Each structure stands twice: as structure tokens, then as C-alpha cells.
Amino acid sequence: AIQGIEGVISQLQATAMAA
Amino acid sequence: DLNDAQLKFANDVESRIQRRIEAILSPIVGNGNVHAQVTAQLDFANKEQTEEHYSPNGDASKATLRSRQLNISEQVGAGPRSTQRNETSNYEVDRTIRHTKMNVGDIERLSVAVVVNYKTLADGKPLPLTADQMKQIEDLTREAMGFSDKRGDTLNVVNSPFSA
Amino acid sequence: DLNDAQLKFANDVESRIQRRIEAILSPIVGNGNVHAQVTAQLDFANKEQTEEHYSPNGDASKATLRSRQLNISEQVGAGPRSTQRNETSNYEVDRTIRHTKMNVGDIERLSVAVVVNYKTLADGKPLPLTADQMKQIEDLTREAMGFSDKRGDTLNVVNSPFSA
Amino acid sequence: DLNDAQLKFANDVESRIQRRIEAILSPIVGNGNVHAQVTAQLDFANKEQTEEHYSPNGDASKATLRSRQLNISEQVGAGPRSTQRNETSNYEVDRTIRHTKMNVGDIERLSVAVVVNYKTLADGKPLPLTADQMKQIEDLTREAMGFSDKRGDTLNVVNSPFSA
Amino acid sequence: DLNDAQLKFANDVESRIQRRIEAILSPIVGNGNVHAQVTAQLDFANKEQTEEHYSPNGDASKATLRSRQLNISEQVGAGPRSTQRNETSNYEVDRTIRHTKMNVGDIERLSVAVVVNYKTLADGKPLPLTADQMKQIEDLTREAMGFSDKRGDTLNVVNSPFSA
């Protein structure tokens, strides 16, 4: 989904912050 | 309802472009010796876009690897030669996700009509302007209107004596 | 109900296009020496569109890979040659999802009818206009109406003496 | 609603660029002997981007390894030679994740129109400026407007006598 | 809302750079004999970055090991020789994780326009400055503005007589 890809990029940002 | 708000938005944008053109066209041509009107084709369609890009890794120099198994066998007895190469490679690739929400109310195509007056000297003869001055007016109007070729903007400036 | 609102929306759009044309056509032709009327074919159909685009990866130079298994065997005994190549490739592709909701009330096709008057000199003879002036009026009206060829816009400006 | 706020934001940015240009153009050309107007194409589209980059490890000198199994066999009987090399390598790669949220309201393309006056000496003759002075004005305006070529900025400064 | 705060932030930064330039340019050129204006392209985009770096271990001298199995066999009967080497190595690698959150409001590109006056002696003749003095002013302005080439900073200082 478009919103699904939005969620994927959001989880990538989450990984960035966690690191 | 919403259509009226969009129309008022278009009217305000057109009026401000008109005023910006008039502001620079006033000092040289003179107050009232220039009239311009602007029409704007706007964008009131909500668009949402997600873009994914993968960097190519077909070249061994820029290819990033995690695990690689290379089984090589050469049973020379060209004669009864027997070559066998089993290669397995797992790659990691660059990834770029871009999420874009276009603004509602952007300008798609702007066309502007400008008319200038003649020059009445102390005698009163309406002497028309020159080619260089017309080119200067065209350039100034292009600068004021934000003229662009990707949008498809059209500009027309003509010289004619104003009526009484 | 809703149809009346759509009709009033069309009437306001047509009136504003008419006024924009009249505004530029007034200073040169003169007050009352120009009349224009606009009709607008509008878009009141709700459309929703989702677009998916994949970048081609048939060329090995732009192909992005995650895993690749290449088993190669050559048992030379052309003689009793035996070549065998088992290739398995998993690709990652660029992806672009665009979601678009078209605005309700957009313009599909605009046709505009403009009529100008003759020129009555100090004597009073209704002298018709010239070809250059007619071309200038046509260009100005095209600029004011936002003339476009993709829409299918039609413009007609004729010169005739006004009645008493 | 939000469109009006965006438009006011654009108006304030344009006014401040105009004032910055006028501030430097005033001391040399003189008060009122310079007029400038600015239009700004802005960015009101919310964009979010995540970037992943992998350092290439195809060269054995920069390749980082965790485990490596190298089975080598050579049964010499070229004769009945039999070479066999089974190599398995697990790598660790450099990784860089960048998450970027672009600001809403950035400038995309700035075009500025500046007009200067002539020079009236003690006699009163409107003597035009020189090429060197025009180049200096162009450079000063480019500095004030933040002229850049990546954006696609256009600047036009013309010299003409101001009207009464 | 937030855009106005960002704009005020930019205005304060530009004003302070202007004042810093004026402070050093005042004692030598004189009060009022120098005017400068600053524009700043700022960074209001929130960025978050995580960087991982692995030290290469391809050279046996810098390679750190935890477990190593080296099976070597040589059955000499080159004749019917049979060499076999099975090597398994587990490595420990240096690792550096850097997490960076870039500041919001940093400067991307600074361009500064400075104008100086002429020198009116006791007679009153506006004598222009010299090349050495102009170079000194350029160097002082570069120092005050924090001139850098990575940012892409541009500086323009011109000499011209001020108007009355």
C-alpha cells in the first residue's frame, strides 16, 4: 500500500534513531 | 462550498501576480500607461507518491556482498578436461524510499496579457514605443510572472494607444 | 440541489473569464466597444486513480540483484563437448506508487465568443479595424481565457458595428 | 485556510528579498532611483526520505570477514591433474542509514526584476549609466537575492529613465 | 507559524553577520562609509544518521581470530602427489557505530554584498580607494562572514561613491 510504504520508511527511521 | 474557496484562492494569486507586474512596469512606462491581467491554471488534486530506488550492483566493483560460495573444480586428464564452477552470491543493495505529498493549490500553467500605452510628447502626438523598450518590458514581465517553460507559460505584450 | 450549485459554479467561472477578457480589451478598444461571453464545459465527476510504475531491469547494467547462483560446467572430451550453465537470479526493482484524486469542478473545454465595435472618427464614419489590431485582440483574448489545445478550446472574435 | 498562510509566507519572503536588494542598491544609485520586485516559487510539499548506503567490498583489501572456509585439494598424478577449491566467505559491511524530513516552505526558484533610473546632472540631462556600473548592480543584486544555478534563478536588471 | 519563526531566525543571523562585518569595516573606512547586507540559506530539515564502520581484516597481520582449524595432508607417492588443505577461520572485527542528529537551523550557503564609499579629501574630491585597500577589505569581510568553500560562499565588495 502507499500507506504501507509510508510505514516501512517510518520503521526505517525508527531503526536509524535506535542505532 | 470548497469550489468557491478554490476560486477565491485563484483570484488572489492572479491579483498578486498582476500587482507585481504593475509595480515594475509603473516607474518606466508611467502610472495608468500599463494594464495587465493574469489567469492561473491551478492544481487542486490531492496526490500522494512513494518512490523506491535501488542502486545497480551488476558491476563487481560496486557490488556489496554478505556471503559468497565459490566451488571451483578442474580435472585435467584439450583432452578430457572437466571444469566446474558453482558460484553463489548474496548481495546487499542501497535503498532510498521517498514519500511525497504534493501541495494542493500549486500553479500548473500561467498565461499573462499585458497592454501598454503610447507616448504622448509635449506636443501631444502619440509616439509608439521602440523595439528595445518592448523587449525590456517583455523581460520584466517574464521576471515578475515567474515565467517558466516546464509549466508552459505564455506571455503576450502588445503596444497600442489607450482610449479616452 | 447539487445541480444548482454546480450551475452557479459554472456561471461564476464564466463571468470571471468574461470580466478578465473585458478588462484588457477595454483600454485599447474602449468602454462598451467590446462585448464577450464565455461558456464552460466543466468536470463534476469524482475520479480516483492509483498508478504503479516499475523501472525495467532487462539490461544487466541497471539490474539490481539480491542473490545469484551461477553453476557452470564444461566437460570437454567439437568432439564430445558438454556445456551446462544453470543461472538463477533474484532482482530488486524500483517502484513508484502514485495516488491521485482529481478535483471536482475542473474545466474540460472552454469556448469564448467576443464581438468588437467599429471605429467612429470625429466625422462619425464607422471605420472598421485592421488585420493587425484584430490579431492583437485575438492574442489578448487567448491569453485572458487561458487558451490551450489539449483542452480543445475554441475562440472566435469578429468585428461588426454595434446597433443603436 | 492553509493556502492563505502559504501565500502570506511567500509574500513576506519576497518582500524581505526586495528590501535586502534595495538596501544595498540605495547608497550608490540613490533613494527612489531603484525599484525591485521579487517573485518566489516555494515548496509546500511534505517529503520524507530514508537513504541506505553500503560500502563496496568486492576488493579483498577492504573486505571485512567474520568466517572463512577454504578447502584446497590438488591430486597430481598436465597429466591427470585434479584441482579443487571450495571457498565460503561471510562478510560484514559498512552501513549508513540517513533519515531526512525536508522543510516545508523552502525556495525552489527565485526570479527578480530590478529597474534603475538615469542620472540627471546639475544641468538636468538624464545621462544613462555605464556598463561597469550595470555589472556592479547585477553582481550586487545576485549577492542580495542569493543567486544560485542549481535552483534555476533568473535575474534581469535594465536601465531606463523613470516617469514623472 | 513555524515558518515565521524560521524566517526570524534567518533575519537575526543575517543581521548579526552584517553587524560583525560593519564592526571591523568601520574603524578604517569610517562610520557610514560602509554598507553591507547578508542573506543566508539555512537548513531546517531534520536529519538522523547512523553510521557503521568495519575495519578490514583481509591481511593476516591485522586479522583477529577466535578459532582456527587447519587440516593439512600431503600423501607423496611430481608423481602421484596429493595435497589437501582444509582451513576454517572465525574472526572478530573492529566495529564503530556513530549516531548523529544534525542541528536544525544550520547555515548551508552564505552570500554577502558589501559596498564602500569613496575618499573625499579636505578639498572634497571623491578619490577612489586602491587595490591593496580593496584586497584588505575583501579579506576582512571573508574573515567576518566565516567564508568557506565547502559551503559555497560568495562575496562581492565593490567601490562606488555614495549618493547624497
Author numbering:
A (entry chain n): 3 to 21
B (entry chain A), C (entry chain B), D (entry chain h), E (entry chain g): 229 to 305, 353 to 439
From the paper:
The bacterial flagellar motor is a huge bidirectional rotary nanomachine that drives rotation of the flagellum for bacterial motility. The cytoplasmic C ring of the flagellar motor functions as the switch complex for the rotational direction switching from counterclockwise to clockwise. The basal body is made up of the LP ring, MS ring, C ring, rod and export apparatus. Here, we present two high-resolution cryo-electron microscopy structures of the C ring-containing flagellar basal body–hook complex from Salmonella Typhimurium, which are in the default counterclockwise state and in a constitutively active CheY mutant-induced clockwise state, respectively.
To obtain the C ring-containing basal body–hook complex in the CW state, we constructed the constitutively active double mutant D13K/Y106W of CheY (hereafter referred to as CheY**), which can mimic CheY-P to tightly bind to the C ring and lock the rotational direction of the motor in the CW state. The density maps of the LP ring, MS ring, rod, hook, and export apparatus in the CW state were locally reconstructed to the higher resolutions ranging from 2.8 Å to 3.8 Å. In the intact C ring-containing basal body–hook complexes, there is one more peptide loop L3, which consists of the residues G310–P322 of FliF and is also extended from the β-collar region of the MS ring, bound in a hydrophobic groove that is formed by the α2–α3 linking loop of FliE6 with the D0 and DC domains of FlgC1 and FlgC6 on the surface of the rod. The more stable MS ring in the C ring-containing basal body–hook complexes indicates that the C ring is also important for the stability of the MS ring during motor assembly.
